[PDB]
Coordinates of C-alpha atoms (C1' of nucleotides) in Angstrom, one line a residue:
Chain A
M1 CA -35.4 6.0 19.6
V2 CA -36.0 4.7 23.1
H3 CA -38.1 1.5 23.1
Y4 CA -37.2 -0.3 26.3
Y5 CA -38.1 0.2 30.0
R6 CA -35.7 -1.3 32.5
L7 CA -37.3 -3.3 35.4
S8 CA -34.2 -2.8 37.6
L9 CA -34.9 -1.4 41.0
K10 CA -31.8 0.7 40.6
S11 CA -33.5 2.9 38.0
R12 CA -36.1 4.1 40.5
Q13 CA -36.1 7.6 42.1
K14 CA -37.4 9.3 45.2
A15 CA -40.9 10.7 45.4
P16 CA -41.5 14.3 46.5
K17 CA -44.2 15.1 49.0
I18 CA -46.4 16.6 46.3
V19 CA -46.5 15.7 42.6
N20 CA -44.7 17.7 39.9
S21 CA -46.8 20.3 38.2
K22 CA -46.1 18.5 34.9
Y23 CA -48.4 15.6 36.1
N24 CA -51.9 15.2 37.5
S25 CA -52.9 15.7 41.1
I26 CA -54.2 12.2 41.1
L27 CA -50.7 11.1 42.0
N28 CA -51.2 12.9 45.3
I29 CA -53.5 10.2 46.7
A30 CA -51.0 7.6 45.5
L31 CA -48.2 9.4 47.3
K32 CA -50.2 9.9 50.5
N33 CA -51.1 6.2 50.8
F34 CA -47.5 5.4 50.0
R35 CA -46.3 7.1 53.2
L36 CA -49.1 5.6 55.3
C37 CA -48.2 2.2 54.1
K38 CA -44.6 2.8 55.3
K39 CA -45.7 4.0 58.7
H40 CA -47.5 0.9 59.7
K41 CA -45.0 -1.8 60.6
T42 CA -46.0 -5.2 59.2
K43 CA -48.1 -7.3 61.5
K44 CA -47.5 -10.2 59.0
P45 CA -45.6 -10.8 55.8
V46 CA -46.9 -8.7 52.9
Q47 CA -47.9 -9.5 49.4
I48 CA -46.8 -6.6 47.1
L49 CA -49.5 -7.0 44.4
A50 CA -52.2 -7.4 47.0
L51 CA -50.9 -4.4 48.9
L52 CA -50.4 -2.0 46.0
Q53 CA -54.2 -2.4 45.7
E54 CA -54.5 0.0 48.7
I55 CA -51.9 2.6 47.6
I56 CA -53.3 3.0 44.1
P57 CA -56.9 4.1 43.9
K58 CA -59.0 2.3 41.4
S59 CA -59.9 5.8 40.4
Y60 CA -56.7 6.1 38.4
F61 CA -57.6 3.0 36.3
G62 CA -61.3 3.0 35.9
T63 CA -62.2 -0.4 34.5
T64 CA -60.6 -3.5 36.0
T65 CA -59.0 -4.5 32.6
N66 CA -56.9 -1.3 32.7
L67 CA -55.9 -2.1 36.3
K68 CA -55.0 -5.6 35.4
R69 CA -53.0 -4.5 32.4
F70 CA -50.8 -2.2 34.6
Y71 CA -50.2 -4.9 37.2
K72 CA -49.0 -7.4 34.6
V73 CA -45.9 -5.1 34.4
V74 CA -45.6 -5.0 38.2
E75 CA -45.6 -8.8 38.3
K76 CA -42.7 -8.8 35.8
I77 CA -40.8 -6.4 38.1
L78 CA -41.4 -8.7 41.2
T79 CA -39.9 -11.7 39.3
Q80 CA -37.4 -9.9 37.1
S81 CA -34.0 -11.1 35.8
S82 CA -30.9 -8.9 35.6
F83 CA -30.9 -6.5 32.6
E84 CA -34.5 -7.5 31.9
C85 CA -36.7 -4.9 30.1
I86 CA -40.1 -4.6 28.6
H87 CA -41.3 -2.5 25.7
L88 CA -42.4 1.0 26.7
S89 CA -45.5 0.7 24.6
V90 CA -46.9 -1.9 26.9
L91 CA -47.6 0.9 29.4
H92 CA -49.8 2.8 27.0
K93 CA -51.2 0.4 24.4
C94 CA -54.6 -1.3 24.4
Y95 CA -55.8 0.8 27.3
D96 CA -59.5 1.9 27.6
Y97 CA -58.6 5.6 27.4
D98 CA -62.2 6.9 27.6
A99 CA -62.9 4.8 30.7
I100 CA -60.7 6.7 33.2
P101 CA -61.7 9.9 35.1
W102 CA -58.5 11.8 34.7
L103 CA -58.3 11.7 30.9
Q104 CA -62.0 12.5 30.1
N105 CA -61.6 16.1 28.9
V106 CA -58.2 15.7 27.2
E107 CA -57.4 15.7 23.5
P108 CA -57.3 12.0 22.2
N109 CA -54.0 12.5 20.2
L110 CA -51.9 13.7 23.2
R111 CA -53.1 11.5 26.1
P112 CA -51.4 8.3 25.1
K113 CA -48.2 10.2 26.0
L114 CA -49.8 11.4 29.2
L115 CA -50.7 8.0 30.4
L116 CA -47.2 6.8 29.6
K117 CA -45.7 9.5 31.8
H118 CA -48.0 8.8 34.7
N119 CA -47.4 5.0 34.5
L120 CA -43.7 5.7 34.6
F121 CA -44.1 8.0 37.7
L122 CA -45.9 5.2 39.6
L123 CA -43.4 2.6 38.6
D124 CA -40.4 4.7 39.4
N125 CA -41.7 6.5 42.5
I126 CA -44.2 4.0 44.1
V127 CA -43.9 0.5 42.7
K128 CA -40.1 0.1 42.8
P129 CA -39.6 2.1 46.0
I130 CA -42.2 0.0 47.9
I131 CA -40.4 -3.2 46.7
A132 CA -37.0 -1.9 47.8
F133 CA -38.5 -0.7 51.1
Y134 CA -39.5 -4.3 52.0
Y135 CA -37.1 -6.6 50.1
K136 CA -33.4 -6.6 49.3
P137 CA -32.6 -8.1 45.8
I138 CA -29.9 -10.7 45.8
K139 CA -28.3 -12.0 42.7
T140 CA -27.6 -15.8 42.9
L141 CA -25.2 -15.7 40.0
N142 CA -26.9 -18.7 38.6
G143 CA -27.6 -16.8 35.4
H144 CA -29.4 -13.5 35.8
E145 CA -31.7 -14.9 38.5
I146 CA -32.6 -12.5 41.4
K147 CA -34.1 -13.6 44.7
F148 CA -35.9 -11.2 47.1
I149 CA -35.2 -11.7 50.8
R150 CA -36.9 -9.7 53.5
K151 CA -34.7 -6.7 54.1
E152 CA -35.6 -7.1 57.8
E153 CA -34.3 -10.6 57.6
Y154 CA -31.2 -9.4 55.6
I155 CA -30.3 -6.7 58.1
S156 CA -30.3 -9.2 60.9
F157 CA -28.2 -11.6 58.9
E158 CA -25.8 -8.8 57.9
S159 CA -25.5 -7.6 61.5
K160 CA -24.7 -11.1 62.8
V161 CA -21.9 -11.5 60.1
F162 CA -20.7 -8.0 60.8
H163 CA -20.3 -8.6 64.5
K164 CA -18.5 -11.9 63.9
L165 CA -16.3 -10.3 61.3
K166 CA -15.3 -7.8 64.1
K167 CA -15.1 -10.4 66.9
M168 CA -12.5 -12.2 64.8
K169 CA -10.2 -9.4 63.7
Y170 CA -11.2 -9.8 60.0
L171 CA -12.8 -6.3 60.0
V172 CA -11.3 -3.4 62.0
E173 CA -12.6 0.2 62.1
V174 CA -10.0 2.8 61.2
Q175 CA -9.9 6.4 62.4
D176 CA -7.6 7.4 59.5
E177 CA -8.7 9.4 56.5
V178 CA -8.2 6.8 53.9
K179 CA -10.9 6.6 51.3
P180 CA -12.5 3.2 50.7
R181 CA -12.0 1.5 47.4
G182 CA -15.6 0.3 47.6
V183 CA -18.5 -0.8 49.8
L184 CA -18.5 -4.1 51.8
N185 CA -21.3 -6.4 50.7
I186 CA -22.3 -9.5 52.8
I187 CA -23.7 -12.1 50.4
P188 CA -25.8 -15.0 51.8
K189 CA -24.5 -18.5 51.0
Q190 CA -26.0 -21.9 52.0
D191 CA -25.1 -22.2 55.7
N192 CA -22.3 -19.6 55.1
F193 CA -21.5 -16.0 54.1
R194 CA -19.3 -14.4 51.4
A195 CA -17.7 -11.0 52.1
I196 CA -17.0 -9.0 49.0
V197 CA -16.2 -5.4 48.1
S198 CA -18.3 -3.6 45.5
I199 CA -15.5 -1.7 44.0
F200 CA -16.2 2.0 43.2
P201 CA -16.1 2.9 39.5
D202 CA -12.6 4.1 38.9
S203 CA -12.2 4.6 35.2
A204 CA -9.3 7.0 35.3
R205 CA -7.0 4.3 36.8
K206 CA -8.5 1.3 35.0
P207 CA -5.7 1.0 32.4
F208 CA -3.0 1.0 35.1
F209 CA -4.8 -2.0 36.7
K210 CA -5.0 -3.8 33.4
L211 CA -1.2 -3.3 33.0
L212 CA -0.6 -4.6 36.5
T213 CA -2.8 -7.7 36.0
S214 CA -1.1 -8.4 32.6
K215 CA 2.4 -8.3 34.2
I216 CA 1.3 -10.7 37.0
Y217 CA -0.1 -13.2 34.5
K218 CA 3.1 -13.3 32.5
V219 CA 5.2 -13.8 35.7
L220 CA 2.8 -16.7 36.2
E221 CA 3.1 -18.2 32.8
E222 CA 6.9 -18.2 32.2
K223 CA 8.2 -19.2 35.7
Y224 CA 5.3 -21.6 36.7
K225 CA 4.2 -24.9 35.2
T226 CA 1.8 -24.2 32.3
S227 CA 1.4 -28.0 31.7
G228 CA -1.4 -27.3 29.3
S229 CA -5.1 -26.9 28.9
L230 CA -7.4 -29.1 30.9
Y231 CA -8.4 -30.8 27.6
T232 CA -4.9 -32.0 26.8
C233 CA -4.3 -33.1 30.3
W234 CA -7.5 -35.2 30.4
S235 CA -7.0 -36.8 26.9
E236 CA -3.4 -37.7 27.6
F237 CA -4.2 -39.1 31.1
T238 CA -7.1 -41.2 29.9
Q239 CA -5.1 -42.7 27.0
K240 CA -2.2 -43.8 29.2
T241 CA -4.3 -45.4 32.0
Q242 CA -5.8 -48.8 31.3
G243 CA -7.1 -49.7 34.8
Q244 CA -9.8 -48.1 36.9
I245 CA -9.2 -44.4 37.5
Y246 CA -9.7 -42.9 41.0
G247 CA -10.1 -39.2 41.5
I248 CA -11.4 -36.4 43.6
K249 CA -12.6 -32.8 43.3
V250 CA -12.3 -30.8 46.5
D251 CA -13.3 -27.2 47.2
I252 CA -11.1 -24.9 49.1
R253 CA -13.1 -22.7 51.5
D254 CA -12.2 -19.0 51.1
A255 CA -9.0 -19.3 49.1
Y256 CA -8.7 -15.5 49.0
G257 CA -9.2 -15.0 52.7
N258 CA -6.5 -17.6 53.7
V259 CA -3.8 -15.9 51.5
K260 CA -1.2 -14.7 54.0
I261 CA -0.4 -11.2 52.9
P262 CA 3.2 -11.0 54.3
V263 CA 4.1 -14.2 52.3
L264 CA 2.5 -12.7 49.2
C265 CA 4.3 -9.4 49.6
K266 CA 7.7 -11.1 49.5
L267 CA 6.7 -13.2 46.5
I268 CA 5.9 -9.9 44.7
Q269 CA 9.3 -8.5 45.8
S270 CA 11.0 -11.7 44.6
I271 CA 9.7 -11.2 41.1
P272 CA 12.6 -10.4 38.7
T273 CA 12.9 -6.7 38.0
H274 CA 12.6 -7.0 34.2
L275 CA 9.2 -8.6 34.7
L276 CA 8.1 -6.0 37.3
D277 CA 9.8 -2.8 38.4
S278 CA 10.2 -1.4 41.8
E279 CA 7.5 1.4 41.7
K280 CA 4.9 -1.2 40.6
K281 CA 6.1 -3.7 43.2
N282 CA 5.7 -1.2 45.9
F283 CA 2.2 -0.2 44.6
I284 CA 0.9 -3.8 44.8
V285 CA 2.3 -4.4 48.3
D286 CA 0.8 -1.1 49.5
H287 CA -2.5 -2.0 47.7
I288 CA -3.0 -5.4 49.4
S289 CA -1.7 -4.2 52.8
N290 CA -4.3 -1.4 53.0
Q291 CA -7.7 -2.7 52.0
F292 CA -10.3 -0.2 53.2
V293 CA -14.1 -0.6 52.7
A294 CA -17.2 1.4 53.7
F295 CA -19.9 -0.2 55.8
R296 CA -22.9 1.6 57.2
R297 CA -21.2 4.9 56.6
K298 CA -18.1 3.9 58.5
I299 CA -14.6 3.0 57.3
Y300 CA -13.2 -0.4 58.0
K301 CA -9.9 -2.3 57.1
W302 CA -10.2 -5.8 55.7
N303 CA -7.6 -7.8 57.6
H304 CA -8.2 -11.4 56.3
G305 CA -6.2 -12.1 53.2
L306 CA -7.1 -10.8 49.8
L307 CA -10.4 -8.9 49.5
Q308 CA -12.8 -10.4 47.0
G309 CA -14.1 -8.0 44.4
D310 CA -10.9 -6.0 44.0
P311 CA -9.5 -6.1 40.5
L312 CA -6.0 -7.3 41.6
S313 CA -7.2 -10.1 43.9
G314 CA -7.9 -12.7 41.2
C315 CA -4.4 -12.7 39.7
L316 CA -2.6 -12.2 43.0
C317 CA -4.4 -15.1 44.6
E318 CA -3.7 -17.2 41.5
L319 CA 0.0 -16.1 41.8
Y320 CA 0.0 -17.1 45.5
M321 CA -1.3 -20.6 44.9
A322 CA 0.7 -21.2 41.8
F323 CA 3.8 -20.8 44.0
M324 CA 2.2 -23.1 46.7
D325 CA 1.1 -25.7 44.1
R326 CA 4.5 -25.8 42.4
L327 CA 6.5 -27.5 45.2
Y328 CA 3.8 -30.1 45.8
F329 CA 2.9 -30.7 42.1
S330 CA 6.5 -31.0 41.0
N331 CA 6.7 -34.2 43.2
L332 CA 3.7 -35.5 41.2
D333 CA 4.2 -39.1 40.1
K334 CA 4.1 -40.0 36.5
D335 CA 0.7 -41.7 36.7
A336 CA -1.2 -38.8 38.1
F337 CA -3.5 -36.1 36.7
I338 CA -3.7 -32.7 38.4
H339 CA -5.7 -29.6 37.5
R340 CA -6.7 -26.6 39.5
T341 CA -9.0 -23.8 38.5
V342 CA -8.8 -21.0 41.1
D343 CA -9.9 -22.8 44.3
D344 CA -11.0 -26.2 42.9
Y345 CA -8.6 -29.2 42.7
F346 CA -9.0 -32.1 40.3
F347 CA -6.6 -35.0 41.0
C348 CA -6.7 -38.5 39.5
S349 CA -4.4 -41.5 39.7
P350 CA -4.7 -45.3 39.0
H351 CA -3.6 -45.9 42.6
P352 CA -6.5 -45.0 45.1
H353 CA -4.0 -44.5 47.9
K354 CA -2.4 -41.7 46.0
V355 CA -5.8 -40.0 45.6
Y356 CA -6.7 -40.5 49.2
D357 CA -3.4 -38.9 50.3
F358 CA -4.2 -35.9 48.1
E359 CA -7.5 -35.2 49.9
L360 CA -5.9 -35.1 53.4
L361 CA -2.8 -33.3 52.0
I362 CA -5.1 -30.4 50.8
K363 CA -7.2 -30.6 54.0
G364 CA -4.0 -30.1 55.9
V365 CA -3.0 -26.9 54.1
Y366 CA -6.3 -25.2 53.3
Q367 CA -9.7 -25.3 54.9
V368 CA -12.0 -27.4 52.8
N369 CA -15.7 -27.0 52.0
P370 CA -16.7 -30.7 52.6
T371 CA -20.2 -30.3 51.2
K372 CA -18.7 -30.0 47.7
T373 CA -16.2 -32.9 47.7
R374 CA -16.9 -35.4 44.9
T375 CA -15.0 -38.6 44.6
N376 CA -15.2 -42.3 43.6
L377 CA -13.0 -43.5 46.5
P378 CA -14.7 -46.4 48.3
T379 CA -13.2 -45.0 51.6
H380 CA -15.7 -42.2 51.5
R381 CA -19.4 -42.1 52.5
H382 CA -21.1 -41.4 49.1
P383 CA -18.9 -42.3 46.2
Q384 CA -19.8 -41.6 42.6
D385 CA -18.2 -42.0 39.2
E386 CA -19.5 -38.7 37.8
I387 CA -17.4 -35.7 39.0
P388 CA -18.3 -32.1 38.1
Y389 CA -15.3 -29.8 37.5
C390 CA -14.9 -26.5 35.6
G391 CA -18.3 -26.7 34.0
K392 CA -18.0 -30.3 32.8
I393 CA -18.8 -33.7 34.2
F394 CA -16.1 -36.4 34.1
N395 CA -16.9 -40.1 34.4
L396 CA -13.9 -41.8 35.8
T397 CA -15.1 -45.3 34.7
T398 CA -16.1 -44.5 31.1
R399 CA -13.7 -41.5 30.7
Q400 CA -16.6 -39.6 29.1
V401 CA -16.8 -35.8 29.7
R402 CA -20.2 -34.1 29.5
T403 CA -21.6 -30.6 30.0
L404 CA -22.7 -29.5 33.4
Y405 CA -25.9 -27.4 33.8
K406 CA -26.6 -25.3 37.0
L407 CA -30.3 -26.0 36.9
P408 CA -31.6 -26.4 40.5
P409 CA -35.2 -27.6 41.1
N410 CA -37.8 -24.9 40.5
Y411 CA -35.3 -22.8 38.6
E412 CA -36.8 -20.5 36.0
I413 CA -35.0 -21.3 32.8
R414 CA -35.5 -17.8 31.4
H415 CA -33.0 -16.5 33.9
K416 CA -30.2 -18.1 31.8
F417 CA -30.8 -15.8 28.8
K418 CA -30.4 -12.0 28.2
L419 CA -33.0 -11.0 25.6
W420 CA -33.0 -7.2 26.3
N421 CA -30.0 -5.1 25.5
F422 CA -30.5 -1.5 26.7
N423 CA -27.7 -0.4 24.3
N424 CA -29.2 -1.8 21.1
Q425 CA -32.9 -1.0 21.2
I426 CA -35.5 -2.7 19.0
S427 CA -38.9 -1.4 18.1
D428 CA -42.1 -3.1 19.4
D429 CA -43.4 -3.1 15.8
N430 CA -40.5 -5.4 14.8
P431 CA -40.6 -8.7 16.8
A432 CA -39.0 -10.3 13.8
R433 CA -35.5 -9.2 14.6
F434 CA -36.0 -9.6 18.4
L435 CA -36.4 -13.3 17.8
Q436 CA -33.6 -13.5 15.2
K437 CA -31.2 -11.7 17.5
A438 CA -32.0 -14.0 20.4
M439 CA -30.9 -16.9 18.1
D440 CA -27.2 -15.8 18.5
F441 CA -24.6 -18.6 18.7
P442 CA -22.5 -17.3 21.7
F443 CA -25.0 -18.0 24.4
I444 CA -24.3 -21.7 24.0
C445 CA -20.9 -21.7 22.4
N446 CA -19.3 -22.9 25.7
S447 CA -21.2 -26.2 25.1
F448 CA -19.7 -26.5 21.6
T449 CA -16.1 -26.7 22.6
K450 CA -13.5 -29.4 21.9
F451 CA -14.6 -31.1 25.1
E452 CA -18.1 -31.9 23.9
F453 CA -17.5 -33.0 20.3
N454 CA -14.2 -34.8 20.2
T455 CA -13.9 -38.5 19.5
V456 CA -10.5 -39.2 21.1
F457 CA -12.0 -40.3 24.5
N458 CA -15.7 -39.4 24.1
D459 CA -18.0 -41.9 22.4
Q460 CA -20.4 -41.0 19.7
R461 CA -23.2 -41.5 22.2
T462 CA -21.7 -38.7 24.4
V463 CA -21.2 -36.4 21.4
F464 CA -24.8 -36.8 20.5
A465 CA -25.9 -36.4 24.1
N466 CA -23.9 -33.2 24.4
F467 CA -25.3 -31.8 21.2
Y468 CA -28.9 -32.7 22.3
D469 CA -28.5 -31.0 25.7
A470 CA -27.1 -27.9 24.0
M471 CA -30.0 -27.7 21.6
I472 CA -32.5 -28.0 24.5
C473 CA -31.0 -24.8 25.9
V474 CA -31.5 -23.2 22.4
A475 CA -35.1 -24.4 22.3
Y476 CA -35.7 -23.0 25.8
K477 CA -34.3 -19.6 24.7
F478 CA -36.6 -19.7 21.7
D479 CA -39.5 -20.3 24.1
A480 CA -38.4 -17.4 26.4
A481 CA -38.2 -15.0 23.4
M482 CA -41.7 -16.0 22.3
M483 CA -43.1 -15.4 25.8
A484 CA -41.4 -12.0 25.9
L485 CA -43.2 -10.9 22.7
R486 CA -46.9 -10.1 22.2
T487 CA -49.4 -13.0 22.1
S488 CA -50.4 -12.3 18.5
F489 CA -46.8 -12.6 17.1
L490 CA -47.0 -16.3 16.6
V491 CA -49.9 -16.8 14.3
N492 CA -49.6 -13.6 12.2
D493 CA -45.9 -14.2 11.4
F494 CA -45.9 -18.0 11.5
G495 CA -44.1 -18.2 8.1
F496 CA -41.3 -15.9 9.4
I497 CA -41.0 -17.8 12.7
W498 CA -40.7 -21.1 10.8
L499 CA -37.9 -19.8 8.6
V500 CA -36.1 -18.5 11.7
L501 CA -36.6 -21.9 13.3
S502 CA -35.4 -23.8 10.2
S503 CA -32.4 -21.6 9.8
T504 CA -31.5 -22.0 13.5
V505 CA -31.4 -25.8 13.2
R506 CA -29.1 -25.7 10.1
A507 CA -26.6 -23.3 11.7
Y508 CA -26.3 -25.2 15.0
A509 CA -26.1 -28.6 13.2
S510 CA -23.6 -27.3 10.8
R511 CA -21.5 -25.7 13.6
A512 CA -21.6 -29.0 15.5
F513 CA -20.7 -31.0 12.4
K514 CA -17.7 -28.9 11.6
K515 CA -16.5 -29.1 15.3
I516 CA -16.8 -32.9 15.2
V517 CA -14.7 -33.4 12.1
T518 CA -11.9 -31.2 13.3
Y519 CA -11.6 -33.2 16.5
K520 CA -11.8 -36.6 15.0
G521 CA -10.4 -39.4 17.1
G522 CA -10.0 -43.1 17.2
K523 CA -13.7 -43.4 18.1
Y524 CA -15.3 -41.2 15.4
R525 CA -17.3 -43.7 13.3
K526 CA -20.0 -42.0 11.3
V527 CA -21.9 -38.8 12.1
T528 CA -24.1 -37.4 9.3
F529 CA -25.4 -33.8 9.0
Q530 CA -28.9 -35.1 8.7
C531 CA -28.7 -37.0 12.0
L532 CA -27.6 -33.8 13.7
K533 CA -30.6 -32.0 12.2
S534 CA -32.9 -34.8 13.5
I535 CA -31.4 -34.4 17.0
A536 CA -31.8 -30.6 17.0
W537 CA -35.4 -30.9 15.8
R538 CA -36.3 -33.4 18.5
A539 CA -34.7 -31.0 21.1
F540 CA -37.2 -28.3 20.0
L541 CA -40.0 -30.9 20.1
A542 CA -39.3 -31.8 23.7
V543 CA -39.3 -28.1 24.8
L544 CA -42.2 -26.9 22.6
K545 CA -44.4 -29.6 24.0
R546 CA -44.3 -28.0 27.4
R547 CA -46.8 -25.6 25.8
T548 CA -48.3 -27.9 23.1
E549 CA -51.4 -25.7 23.1
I550 CA -49.6 -22.5 22.0
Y551 CA -47.0 -24.2 19.8
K552 CA -49.1 -26.9 18.1
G553 CA -48.8 -25.4 14.7
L554 CA -45.0 -25.4 15.1
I555 CA -45.0 -28.9 16.4
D556 CA -46.9 -30.2 13.4
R557 CA -44.7 -28.8 10.7
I558 CA -41.7 -30.3 12.5
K559 CA -43.3 -33.8 12.4
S560 CA -44.8 -33.5 8.9
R561 CA -41.9 -32.1 6.9
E562 CA -38.7 -33.0 8.9
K563 CA -37.1 -36.4 9.1
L564 CA -37.0 -37.4 12.8
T565 CA -35.3 -40.8 12.3
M566 CA -31.6 -40.9 13.4
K567 CA -29.1 -43.0 11.5
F568 CA -26.0 -43.3 13.7
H569 CA -23.4 -46.1 13.0
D570 CA -22.7 -46.4 16.8
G571 CA -24.7 -49.3 18.2
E572 CA -24.1 -48.9 22.0
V573 CA -26.3 -45.8 21.9
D574 CA -29.7 -45.3 23.5
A575 CA -32.3 -43.7 21.2
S576 CA -34.7 -43.1 24.1
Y577 CA -32.7 -40.2 25.4
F578 CA -33.5 -38.2 22.2
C579 CA -37.3 -38.8 22.6
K580 CA -38.1 -36.7 25.7
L581 CA -36.8 -33.8 27.8
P582 CA -33.6 -34.9 29.7
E583 CA -33.8 -35.4 33.4
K584 CA -32.1 -32.0 34.0
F585 CA -34.4 -29.9 31.9
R586 CA -37.7 -31.8 32.7
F587 CA -38.2 -30.0 36.0
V588 CA -37.2 -26.4 35.1
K589 CA -40.1 -24.0 35.7
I590 CA -41.3 -22.1 32.6
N591 CA -44.2 -20.0 34.0
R592 CA -43.7 -16.6 35.6
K593 CA -45.7 -15.8 38.7
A594 CA -45.2 -13.3 41.5
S595 CA -44.1 -15.0 44.7
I596 CA -43.7 -11.8 46.8
Chain B
rU1 C1' -23.6 -7.6 44.6
rC2 C1' -18.2 -6.9 42.6
rC3 C1' -13.8 -8.7 40.0
rA4 C1' -10.3 -11.1 37.1
rG5 C1' -9.7 -15.0 33.4
rG6 C1' -11.6 -17.6 29.3
rU7 C1' -15.0 -19.4 25.1
rG8 C1' -16.5 -17.4 21.0
rC9 C1' -19.6 -14.8 17.5
rA10 C1' -20.5 -10.4 15.0
rC11 C1' -18.9 -5.7 13.2
rA12 C1' -15.6 -1.7 10.3
rA13 C1' -11.2 0.6 8.5
rA14 C1' -7.0 0.1 6.4
rG15 C1' -3.4 -2.0 4.1
rA16 C1' -1.8 -5.4 2.0
rA17 C1' -2.1 -9.9 -1.0
Chain C
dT1 C1' -11.9 -10.3 -4.5
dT2 C1' -9.8 -12.1 -0.3
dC3 C1' -7.1 -11.9 3.8
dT4 C1' -5.0 -9.8 7.8
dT5 C1' -4.2 -6.7 11.1
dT6 C1' -5.9 -3.0 14.4
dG7 C1' -10.0 -1.7 16.9
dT8 C1' -15.3 -2.1 18.6
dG9 C1' -19.7 -4.5 20.7
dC10 C1' -22.0 -8.5 23.0
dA11 C1' -23.5 -13.2 25.2
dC12 C1' -22.1 -17.0 27.4
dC13 C1' -18.6 -19.9 30.6
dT14 C1' -14.9 -20.5 35.0
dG15 C1' -14.0 -19.6 40.1

RNA sequence: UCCAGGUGCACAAAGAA
DNA sequence: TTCTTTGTGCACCTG
C-alpha cells in the first residue's frame, strides 16, 4: 500500500562499512568509492551528477539507458521541492533486467523486487549522503522551494553570525543544566541573517501552549482596538476620501528581537486575573526570561527579545506592539487609515505631511528595513502608486486592490504546489485521480477572497484581472501535475484529461461568479458566467502554449469547441491582457534541470 | 529551518429539524 | 431529506 518515495534528504541513513547480507556485494564497490570521494578535499566546485559517475560503477547498470534511467531520479533529488515524492515503480520499471551482470542468474519473477531494494540502498546510503556532505539545503519559504548552498560556505557564514551574536551579548553560553527548547538555526537573508529556534517536538505539553496562546489572543481582542478587517478599513477609507491618497508601507527590522522583555513581563502581570491567572502569568514570564538553545552541542541563552520559532513568541510579540500601537493609534486623526500585520505598517492619509510624519515616527521607535519601504510620497527617491501589503497590491490613485505573487525571476513555478501527499498515497496505475486531486480549490482560494472580486472600490477590469491571474496559477499547477506523471498519460487518457479540464473551468468560474454577486458594489455592471469561462480558458491557453508541442491536442479542442470571445459591459477594460501570459508569469521557469 | 494566526475546501457521526 | 453541531484531514495565505 506504499506507492511514494520521498526525495527529502532527511529520509537518508548512514552506510555501514560493508553491505548487509540481504543485498549484493556489488554495493561494496559503491561504498568504497564513496569514502574515497569524501577523503579528497575538493580542488574545485563539484557537479553531483558528474561525480556520482565515479562512485557508481557502470557494472551495476550495464547498458547506458539503465544508467540514465536511474540518474533521472537523482536529478529530481538535486532540484527537489519540500514534500516532493516520486512513484516507487520508477526505480524498477522499464529497466533492461537481462542486461546487468548482477541479475543474470536470478529468477525473473523476484528480481524486480531486488533491483528496487538495491536502488533504494544507493539513494538512501550514497546519493542523499553525498549531497548532504557537500551542500546544506535551505528553504526560501517562497513556496516549497529549496536552494542548496555549499556547506563549506554555510559554515563560514554561520560562524561569522555566531561570533557577532556573541560579541553583542545576544547569545551567551550558560554553564547551567537547563535543557534547550530547540536548536538555533542561522538562516541566510539578503545582506542579513535571521536567527530562529527549531523547537523540539513537545507533544505532551502542546495543549497547554494552545491554551496559553488562546488566552493571550482574547486579552488582545477585548482590551485593544479591533477596528476591523483590513477589507472594511480599506473600503471605508477609500469611499470617504475624494482627493489624492498618500500612503506608505514600512518594514520593521527584527520586531521580535527588539521587544524589551522586562516591559513585556509587566504587561503580562498587568493582565486582569480573570483573563489570566497567577500560575500562568508566572509561567510566561519564566518562559520568555529563560530562552535556551543548543548550538554546536553547546547550550546558549538567547538574550535579545523574543526568540523566533517559539510557539508563544508570535502572540506575545503581537501583544507587545498592540500595547505600543494603542497610545499612538488612538491619536489618529479622522482622515487616516492604519493597519499593521505583525511587523508591517500600512498608513494612508489625504495629507502627505501626515504620512511623512508617520514614516519618521516609526523610524524613531523601531529599526526599519529601508529596502522594503514603499510609498508614493514625492519627498522620497523612488515613489510608486502600487504598494504591496499583506499579500495584496494597493493602488493609491485608482484605489484598486490586486493580488500579489512572490514570483522572482528564474523561479520554478512548480515549487508553489504540493502534488505528493505521503499520508494519502496514490497508485502509479491511476494517474486519473492524481490529476483530479491536484485540481483542489484551496491552493488558490486566497486569491478568491472578498478583496479580489468585490465591486465597491474595485472596477470590473480589476475583478477580471484578478480572476485571470488566479486561473494562470491553476493552469500552471495543471502543467506541473502533467509533468510529474508518465509521458504516455496524455494521449492514452486524452478523453479523461479533457473532462477534468472542462470540469475545472466550470468550478472555478462558478466559484468566482458566486463570489462576485455576493460582494456587489456600486461598480458591478455586468459579469456573465460565460465571460468568466472564456477568461479561464484563455488562462489555460497562455500556459499550455509554453509547451505547444506536448499540449497541441489540448490547445486545439479549447479553440475549436469553446467560445473565446468575452462580452463585458465595462468599456474602460483592456482585452489584450487576457490574450497572453501576464508579465509576472511570463518569465517563470518551467523546466527542471540539475544546477548542482 | 521553526512558529503562531488566517483563508477555505473536503470528510463522518450524531442529533436534531 | 436536510441541517447543524462536534470532530478529522489537507492546501494555500500572512508575517
